[PDB]
Amino acid sequence: IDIKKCNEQARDARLQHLEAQALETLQKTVENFEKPAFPCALIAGDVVILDLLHRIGAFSDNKVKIIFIDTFHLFPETYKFLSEVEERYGFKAHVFHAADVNNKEAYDAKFGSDLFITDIEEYDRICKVEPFSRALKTLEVDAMINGRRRDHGAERAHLEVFEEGKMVKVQPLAYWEFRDCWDYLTKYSLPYHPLHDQGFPSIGDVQSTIPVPREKWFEYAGERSGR
Template sequence: MTAPRPPALSKPLELPLTKDDLDNINLYLSPLTPEEILQWALDYLPNLYQTTAFGLTGLVAIDMLSKLTSNPPPLIFLDTLYHFPETYELVEEVKRRYGVDVTVYKPEGCESVEEFERMHGERLWETDEPAYDFAVKVEPARRAYAVLHVQSVITGRRASQGGARASLQPLEVDSTGLLKLNPLFAWNFHLVEWYVAEHRVPRNRLLDAGYKSVGDWHSTVKSGAGDAGERAGRWAGREEKTECGLHVDYFKMKGKAGKAG
């Protein structure tokens, strides 16, 4: 039986949220299915978009939303300029399959790898990885959210991915006030794979070529026999790194005051 909806809810959700409001919402959302969480988001979250790198979980959310509404949240794709060709092919396949528009944001002032490297130097991911993550993901995301007036985003994060995501909640608020919905937070990788196969969801062809998780070509390798973890092969040789950079709270890192509401 579904728990009663928190009294704080309205149409749309009023911001900022208090910590108590957020806790009550997560208490309500936690036992729901991903589809129910997404329907709740469609009903309540203001200025809702989906930020996706077209990983499996994001693709599952795209497919679920296509079945819930004829007007799904717009998609934002952060093009780091270093994606595999197969990833760009997948973007086009998703656009054809679901008839959705994808708004693309690239590093500021850059349309190509050559322009990026003239501005930032070669192999920035090796010389200053935090600066690279900020330039190719965080800054473009912040710019997208400002231009599009985004207040809420759907992510593809799951607790079973481990690392910083192990204690993930259905709904989070970062220090900028952005609402982050994680509809598949409780699913493990096997459930995601089952859904993709059952519903014939488009997927990156590299997953059939020995890759477990696909990011930028320079930091993604095929997973070896016995590799543990569903993100094996990402950030090879940097075991301490568990986040791509987009969901690292740089504002808190810089000592700025965060707010849950």
């Protein structure tokens, strides 16, 4: 008995299950909702969800829209990668940002470049929360596909593949561990956000993204433990 091989075969069958579960969930979503959308930050599970949507043909007729929130404080690498996935999968993201401000220089002029330090709650409202809420209303989203997973822990620990509400939320990767997301990216040789190679399991704004030791990434709730 080759122990390593037997363990690999079990994880192979695990990932086939998890892929089927995600795909079935996404197919049910496209069939049952008129205006589904996915807010995408280009982190590892988000890249998995892009690839799964591509697989079921969700981009061919713009059935599923991709939402991208430009906070004006993302890594340069994140904008470059967004362009690459747009080209790879044939969609253009619907970009939302701080209200009435076209770019970071305009944002700095209106609000001050150091708002994130002096009042983080105002910064969050202006650059993250209001644009996301406006994106969902503008696009009349009736099902929000998202990368929340149970292995995020705390208030996400008991999510299922669907969550009830006036707007339905859809978690195709509810049961995937972070490690399963990475096995998928490896199995299909998919490009991922380059900052994952520089020790960041999760990637957000430059001022608030911190690296995490690699031995911690695959513990329960490890992905977002930087913050």
